Write a protein that binds this ligand. Structure first.
Ligand SMILES: Nc1cccc2c1C(=O)N([C@H]1CCC(=O)NC1=O)C2=O
Ligand SMILES: [Zn+2]
Ligand SMILES: [Zn+2]
Lengths: 825, 401, 30
């Protein structure tokens, strides 16, 4: 019976894919960038990029490739979603109105099959003869590129090679030949096949089956005049082409594996390569004119160009301009000069584009107590790690680099400062200790400190490590709210991991402290068997270790519960009281669980959450001084985060980018009925949520006693998207769902994909339609359509204005309603 | 403790030679759809809580049982086994199906005897129970589905790293030094994208089927050295059911473990129990210590514990251990209908409450090793968590994870 | 003459009549 409302306040910024071509016109040079559910088109100019259109799809962009058929004015695009919805698109412009047309659409999801290990794969033949897809191990789906196939009918061909790593099409081959790298018990091998359409099957490949590097991780299709293919791995770069073989083992790349690439020169003389550490290399191929006129491959060559943002994809944009599509850090635009800079790098950074993804934790604060609201988030990772500050302006963002992975965050009013958990990477140096790779916030702190406890010095005596191994050094940073300076940096013990963080007053002590929970990690024995709870005080510009308490487990989470400190240790939940001697003493406990990961509280109610086993509820009993198990859920789905809506509804994000909401029962009935939770809400968000908060960025009304939305909960994800969720009333829910149906009747879908299918709770076993939710984006889209369609939507619809009489709805009434809704974020 | 393991044959008990001449075996199997509704008959005096994949021998005497068996021999050869939570009220909310794989009738000595060997198959939840005029009762049952999930990383996995998610030369060279290096590389690679979430790698590693199975393998080798990675199934579902089938637990905890739907949670529970309960006391006394897990060892191919049938059609989920204590022996040793050929049994009672605990197997030949061991019935034991831990934090018998 | 009595549940051998009746009470009790 629960009714809720979800809306996006910030678009996903993480770049998951990019391509180049001629999409708008054969003359204009186009660059297409995918951001999960959004697509952006740009025209390449010598100075920068000229935006033309930005569209929102009803699917998670998985594959995105451009191509040119025979007898076509320009390049056509092909997009495949996560739910296996495929569509080909063309561009059309009729004056000031720019719309994206769908040529052909359809779903390719099979009734059965094992979703592949290396994810969905998609390739196009160079001559545009067919589209090849790999969705299930052993099955190769073929889609003929005939004009007749408006329905996108396909057919499967069964493969003997099971664990295929990669596959590509070959150039200059009279038969649509596929060359792929796979693995078998004897090692990793490269093999070729010829796809025949009238045979609707395979034919013997042109080449032989040759063995390759056991770490062969990428295949690159070489264009004419060379042809053949290139194989990239951890330590080797080879080139095969029937009668031609070349190989190079450049030591420059052995540090990290290459993951992404793109073509620079169409002829195949230069390629760009990107590694996991953000290093950009250049592959160069030589030629040598023979008497016949056929240039043979003299040799290969690789040279490091420089360091950029940790890239997910790459592309060349002429004029020495390159685009670094990053999803860990800010996206970049760089220039390539033939001469090195004063430092020695060939790459020059031209521009940066903020990327909030991945958000791991955040908090809502009001620095300048306007009653408006500001958001502070932990974005990025590794050298891209950073903090982001967001407000209304449209939206205003402020960046703060860290150069180390941020984890949690917290605020202190009395001290006007923030506390953040971070983690840097160090390497085993020449001696017994370790040293850092690059400067981070923990190493450049104005004032620093180290923990000195001697509780675990003995027992599990610290164990050795080899040279060249990486390790995570954790830290707690204290920062000013205005200047954002690295005021203090405390370095935790070795073999330790910080997990939780809170700041509050407990007992009757008026001072505000920072409370941290840790766990002793050892490469032996899976789950930890040790851990600490530490209390620090910020005073006079330095942190002082106030108190400590030992526990035989990991402190996953903590919270303030009516002056006391509630915490979780492995499968147990424990409550601590702050003694008069300024220490901590246990009170009560609870055991049965899978793992007490997530913890939330409201009044005398507490919610505990597991990684998969959903959740359970507890209530502190005053006289008993103990707990009482209230209710629980069973569904085994990977939980990502949870939050308390009110004293009866609870929200939780799960594995398949889904959100489910449960409810309790206050009535009598039976003890069995009270103790179970009802899955009263299901929805497919399309994002991986990681953190929830209470508050908003809009002024807290008070002027209107009649608020349309009750409650407010912000949430952050991985792709850099931020959203708001609230609760509604029964009538509002019914009317908005009717509006949902009426809107979908009219609106054009990007790729002709039904909105109802896109927002359907989806897993590998079960796919259900949304319930107890309202898509805010679709409700808001009502304002942007033409007026004739606005009138078509509100045609023959009963609406209740001011809770008076039900009357016929006009376009103006709905416009006012939707405007009031939009003004909540 | 570290005693001998050589000389006997672990394949002798698995055959259940004590039942006599080779039976008429059937090989045609049956499995219904998940969540499907089926009407199945129930065996009355089966006070055992069956696990899928667990072998179950039976000797039936009543004419109604024999008639139902005759009717099933031509049909699907499948029946049901209720999981009696409260044996007094005959209450059962769940159960497990069982398929007959060996059969033999005997009209010798003027008594209708029927010997049967069956195996577990599917879990189920009870919907309704009816009773026909002929005594044999029917049950309207719903098949419980096996909920399997994809790897935790599937959702967050970055597209650029999808390639090489597969590891080169898949297996390790059995050695656990090469394997420690391998597990560290495995954790760094498979769970790399963990950096994008609220938790670290080592947390997810606790919820990975592979890691859990390896830890369980390490615990199993400790009990018997005649183990090969081949003997154990690779499927985590069948692996989990097999592990659970030979873990000595009480009925309540067995019911709880069966209720689990996901194999990941089942394996987590199993590892937790294996670590927790280090003592095994008398179920009736609760305070009389009988043995520890240090004394546990596998005398059969399946594992240390397994179900065996007796001359009077009673089933005993018996566990093989080296040493026991606080037991008085009743009668004299006998080889009559012995489950372990070459050994003679002697009834064992608790010296305090005088409750039957099991039997003492003594070798008939001097060359055999071990010369003696103990077989304890599961129904008469109680797993106890070690006390201590400064004694400032106590506990109670509870299934964690 | 009157050979020993034994329990059907566990084979517990005994002598006097009701002794085994006592022993068997300790099995299906709980
Ligand atoms: N001679 C008797 C007599 C009555 C009951 C039993 C036995 C007997 O041998 N077993 C078990 C225990 C000994 C063994 O290993 N096999 C059995 O069938 C009984 O329950
Ligand atoms: Zn006892
Ligand atoms: Zn007895």
């Amino acid at each position: 019976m629960s009714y809720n409302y979800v809306v996006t306040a910030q678009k996903p910024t993480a770049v998951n894919g990019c391509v180049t071509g001629h999409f708008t016109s054969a003359e204009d040079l186009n660059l297409l960038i995918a951001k999960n559910t959004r697509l952006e088109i740009y025209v390449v100019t010598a100075e920068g990029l000229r935006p033309v259109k930005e569209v929102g799809m009803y699917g998670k962009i998985a594959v995105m490739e451009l191509f040119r058929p025979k007898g076509e004015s320009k390049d056509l695009l092909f997009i495949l979603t996560a739910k296996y919805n495929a569509c080909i698109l063309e561009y059309k412009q009729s004056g000031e109105s720019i719309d994206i047309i769908t040529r052909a659409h359809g779903n390719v999801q099979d009734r059965i099959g094992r979703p592949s290990e290396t994810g969905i794969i998609g390739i196009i033949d160079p001559e545009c003869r067919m589209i090849g897809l790999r969705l299930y191990d052993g099955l190769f789906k073929v889609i003929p590129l005939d004009r007749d196939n408006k329905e996108l009918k396909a057919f499967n061909i069964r493969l003997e090679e099971l664990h295929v790593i990669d596959v590509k099409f070959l150039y200059g081959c009279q038969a649509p030949t596929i060359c792929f790298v796979y693995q078998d018990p004897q090692g990793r091998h490269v093999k070729t096949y010829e796809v025949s359409l009238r045979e609707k099957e395979f034919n013997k490949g042109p080449w032989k089956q040759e063995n390759v590097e056991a770490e062969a991780s990428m295949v690159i299709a070489v264009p004419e005049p060379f042809g053949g293919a290139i194989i990239i791995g951890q330590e080797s770069i080879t080139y095969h082409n029937g009668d031609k073989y070349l190989a190079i083992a450049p030591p420059i790349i052995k540090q990290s594996t290459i993951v992404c690439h793109n073509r620079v020169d169409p002829n195949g003389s230069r390629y760009l390569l990107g590694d996991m550490e953000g290093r950009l290399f250049m592959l160069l191929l030589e030629k040598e004119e023979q008497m016949d006129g056929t240039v043979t491959l003299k040799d290969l060559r690789v040279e490091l160009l420089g360091e950029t943002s940790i890239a997910e994809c790459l592309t060349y944009l002429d004029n020495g301009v390159v685009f670094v599509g990053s999803r860990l850090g800010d996206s970049q635009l760089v220039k390539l000069n033939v001469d090195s800079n004063e430092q020695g790098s060939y790459v020059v950074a031209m521009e940066t584009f903020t990327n909030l993804g991945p958000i791991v934790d955040m908090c809502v604060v009001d620095l300048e107590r306007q009653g408006q609201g500001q958001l502070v988030t932990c974005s990025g990772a590794f050298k891209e790690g950073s903090l982001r500050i967001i407000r209304n302006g449209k939206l205003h963002i402020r960046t703060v680099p860290l150069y180390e992975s941020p984890r949690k965050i917290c605020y202190q009013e009395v001290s006007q400062c923030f506390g953040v958990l971070s983690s840097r990477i160090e390497v085993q140096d020449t001696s017994g200790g370790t040293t850092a790779l690059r400067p981070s916030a923990s190493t450049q702190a104005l004032s620093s400190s180290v923990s000195s406890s001697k509780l675990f010095s003995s027992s599990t005596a610290p164990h050795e490590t080899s040279f060249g191994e990486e390790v995570e050094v954790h830290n707690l940073l204290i920062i000013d709210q205005h200047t954002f300076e690295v005021l203090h940096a405390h370095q935790f013990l070795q073999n330790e991991y910080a997990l939780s963080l809170v700041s509050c007053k407990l007992g009757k002590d008026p001072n505000t402290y920072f409370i941290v929970g840790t766990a002793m990690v050892y490469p032996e024995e899976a789950e930890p068997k040790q851990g600490r709870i530490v209390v620090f005080q910020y005073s006079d510009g330095k942190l002082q270790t106030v108190a400590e308490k030992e526990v035989k487990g990991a402190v996953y989470s903590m919270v303030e519960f009516n002056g006391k400190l509630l915490a979780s240790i492995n499968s147990t939940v424990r409550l601590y009281e702050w003694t008069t001697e300024k220490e901590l003493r246990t009170e009560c406990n609870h055991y049965n669980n899978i793992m007490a990961l997530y913890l939330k509280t409201k009044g005398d109610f507490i919610l505990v959450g597991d990684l998969m086993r959903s959740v359970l509820l507890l209530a502190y009993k005053p006289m008993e001084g103990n707990f009482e198990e209230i209710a629980r859920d069973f569904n085994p789905n990977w939980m990502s985060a949870v939050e308390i809506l009110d004293d009866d509804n609870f929200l939780g994000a799960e594995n398949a980018f889904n959100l489910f909401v449960c409810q309790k029962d206050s009535a009598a009935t039976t003890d069995e009925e009270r103790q179970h939770l009802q899955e009263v809400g299901l929805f497919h968000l399309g994002e991986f949520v990681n953190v929830f908060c209470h508050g908003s960025l809009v002024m807290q009304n008070l002027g209107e006693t009649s608020t349309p939305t009750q409650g407010s909960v912000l949430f952050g994800t991985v792709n850099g998207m931020i959203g708001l969720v609230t609760s509604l009333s029964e009538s509002w829910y019914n009317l908005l769902l009717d509006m949902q149906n009426r809107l979908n009747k009219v609106i054009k879908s990007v790729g002709k994909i039904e909105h109802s299918f896109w927002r359907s709770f989806h897993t590998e076993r079960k796919t259900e339609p949304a319930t107890g939710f309202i898509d805010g984006d679709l409700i808001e889209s009502f304002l942007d359509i033409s007026r004739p369609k606005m009138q078509e939507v509100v045609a023959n619809l009963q609406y209740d204005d001011g809770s008076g009489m039900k009357r016929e709805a006009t376009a103006d009434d709905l416009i006012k309603v939707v405007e009031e809704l939009t003004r909540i974020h | 403790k570290k005693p001998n393991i050589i000389n006997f044959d672990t394949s002798l008990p698995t055959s259940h030679t004590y039942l006599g001449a080779d039976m008429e075996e059937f090989h045609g199997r049956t499995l219904h759809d998940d969540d499907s509704c089926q009407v199945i008959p129930v065996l009355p005096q089966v006070m055992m809580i069956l696990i899928p994949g667990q072998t179950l021998p039976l000797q039936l005497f009543h004419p109604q049982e024999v008639s139902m068996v005759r009717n099933l021999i031509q049909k699907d050869r499948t029946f049901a086994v209720l999981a009696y939570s409260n044996v007094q009220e005959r209450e059962a909310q769940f159960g497990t199906t069982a398929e007959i794989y060996a059969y033999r009738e005997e009209q010798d000595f003027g008594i209708e005897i029927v010997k049967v060997k069956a195996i577990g198959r599917q879990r189920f939840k009870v919907l309704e129970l009816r009773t026909q005029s002929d005594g044999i009762q029917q049950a309207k049952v719903q098949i419980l589905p096996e909920c399997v999930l994809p790897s935790t990383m599937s959702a967050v996995q970055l597209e650029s790293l999808n390639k090489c998610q597969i590891f080169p030369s898949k297996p390790v060279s059995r050695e656990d030094q090469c394997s420690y290096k391998w597990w560290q590389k495995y954790q760094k690679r498979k769970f790399h994208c963990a950096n994008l979430t609220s938790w670290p790698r080592w947390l997810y590693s606790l919820y990975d089927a592979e890691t859990l199975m390896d830890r369980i393998k390490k615990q199993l080798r400790e009990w018997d050295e005649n183990l090969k990675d081949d003997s154990l199934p690779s499927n985590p579902i069948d692996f989990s059911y097999r592990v659970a089938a030979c873990l000595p637990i009480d009925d309540v905890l067995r019911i709880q473990l069966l209720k689990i739907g996901s194999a990941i949670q089942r394996l987590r529970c199993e590892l937790d129990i294996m670590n927790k309960c280090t003592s095994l006391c008398c179920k009736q006394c609760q305070e009389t210590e009988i043995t520890t897990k240090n004394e546990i060892f596998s005398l059969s191919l399946c594992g240390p514990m397994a179900a065996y049938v007796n001359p009077h059609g009673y089933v005993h989920e018996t566990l093989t251990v080296y040493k026991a204590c606080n037991l008085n022996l009743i009668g004299r040793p006998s080889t009559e209908h012995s489950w372990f050929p070459g050994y003679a049994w002697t009834v064992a009672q608790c010296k305090i409450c005088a409750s039957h605990i099991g039997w003492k197997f003594t070798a008939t030949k001097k060359d055999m090793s071990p010369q003696k061991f103990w077989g304890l019935t599961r129904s008469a034991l109680l797993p106890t968590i070690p006390d201590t831990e400064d004694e400032i934090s106590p506990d109670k018998v509870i299934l964690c994870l | 003459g009157g050979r020993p009595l034994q329990c059907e549940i566990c084979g517990f051998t005994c002598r006097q009549k009701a002794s085994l009746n006592w022993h068997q009470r300790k099995h299906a009790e709980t």
